[PDB]
Amino acid sequence: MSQSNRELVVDFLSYKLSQKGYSWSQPMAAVKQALREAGDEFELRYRRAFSDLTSQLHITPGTAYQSFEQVVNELFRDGVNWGRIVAFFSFGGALCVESVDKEMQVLVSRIASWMATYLNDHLEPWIQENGGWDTFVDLYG
Amino acid sequence: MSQSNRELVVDFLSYKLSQKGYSWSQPMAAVKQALREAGDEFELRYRRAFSDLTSQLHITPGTAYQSFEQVVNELFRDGVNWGRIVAFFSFGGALCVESVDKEMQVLVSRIASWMATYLNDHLEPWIQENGGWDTFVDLYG
Amino acid sequence: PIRYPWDVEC
Amino acid sequence: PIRYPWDVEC
Ligand SMILES: *CC(=O)NCCNC(=O)c1ccc(-c2nc(C(*)=O)cs2)cc1
Ligand SMILES: *CC(=O)NCCNC(=O)c1ccc(-c2nc(C(*)=O)cs2)cc1
């Protein structure tokens, strides 16, 4: 429970400081906000091409990570750019919405873990040589 | 960066699911919300007694954790109850607001770490024998 | 033991 | 290589 209790402390203090007119911003806050905004814009700019990407995979309780990695590896087959990273997040979002639509809310945490794995293995190493998430925020935030 | 990237994934998916009318609630979300509400109510119910508690400590860059532990140990000297736990969070909040008022925003993360330590050492063991944070949420949420 | 007004409720 | 419309901007 130590990690949970640390996150509870930071949430309460953030809330209290904001109530008194002070902003105590957490490290990834601007990255989270920029990615939310970038995904919304991506889904409104690229409806047809995004539909073609999301049509490549339908997750069920039986699906293995390899099925997800194969489809996402096609997105990145000839390398990474920030537009493809946004597409990756939007793609995972769409798989989660499909899951909940089909009464398989239980798959959302699995897709989350798959996306984290695929960040760890493929994307983080590119991000660390291309200006970090802070470059993303300056480009897209 | 693996932990940060996992938190980015959960933030984006939570946001996207909420945009489509679905709630993907994180484990501590109801505890965070109940504690925010409990601290606000505590500070409005107990102004004089809370002022007497916050007057016991003024943190500066030189202050050691022992000074904080001694004052908080008085709050819990003869045991724990949920009202005293709320007082502890409100107390830390007030120390953070004082810090920012005095242009020592740098102390907020130190106070956060002190509060997490004091949860770990003193409060979590009581919480785990008294119904967990879920009992807090049922009592105060 | 009751020492603070917040203790009354517990 | 440009394969998607989102690649154009990069
Ligand atoms: C407000 C709260 O904690 N409600 C849950 C039910 N009450 C208790 O669990 C409880 C806990 C601890 C005590 C203590 N007694 C002594 C002296 O009064 C100090 S803390 C009473 C009741
Ligand atoms: C949108 C973005 O990434 N902007 C940052 C500047 N551009 C680049 O850093 C960049 C990255 C990767 C590529 C790739 N080229 C190939 C084929 O087109 C696939 S990814 C181009 C530019």
Numbering used by the authors:
A (entry chain A), B (entry chain A): 1 to 141
C (entry chain B), D (entry chain B): 2 to 11
What did the paper state?
On the other hand, we obtained cp3 from the BCL-XL targeted screening. The affinities of cp3 to BCL-XL and BCL-2 were measured as 0.09 ± 0.01 μM and 0.24 ± 0.02 μM, showing a clearly improved binding to BCL-XL as compared with cp1. We surprisingly noticed that only the CPs containing a proline residue at the 6th position could be enriched in our screening against BCL-XL, implying this residue may be essential in the binding and selectivity of CPs. However, the buried interface between cp3 and BCL-XL is only 464.8 Å2, although its binding affinity to BCL-XL is the highest (0.09 ± 0.01 μM) among the three CPs. Subsequently, we further analyzed the interactions between cp3 and BCL-XL, and found that cp3, like a small protein, can be roughly divided into three sites that each directly contact the corresponding sites of BCL-XL respectively. These three sites of cp3 exhibit different properties, with Site 1’ (cp3-D8) negative charged, Site 2’ formed by linker of CPs (cADT) and Site 3’ composed by some hydrophobic residues (cp3-Y5, cp3-W7). To test this hypothesis, we measured the binding affinity of BCL-2 D111A to cp3, and obtained a KD value of 0.09 ± 0.02 μM (comparable to the KD value of BCL-XL to cp3), indicating a nearly 3-fold improved affinity than that of BCL-2 WT (0.24 ± 0.02 μM).
These proteins bind to and sequester the apoptosis effectors, as well as the apoptosis sensitizers, BIM, BID, PUMA, NOXA, BAD, BMF, HRK and BIK5,6. An elongated hydrophobic groove is thus formed along the surface of BCL-2 and BCL-XL proteins, spanning approximately 20 Å to serve as the binding site for the amphipathic α-helical BH3 domains of their pro-apoptotic partners. Herein we present cyclic peptides (CPs) with nanomolar-level binding affinities to BCL-2 or BCL-XL, and further reveal the structural and functional mechanisms of how these CPs target two proteins in a fashion that is remarkably different from traditional small-molecule inhibitors.
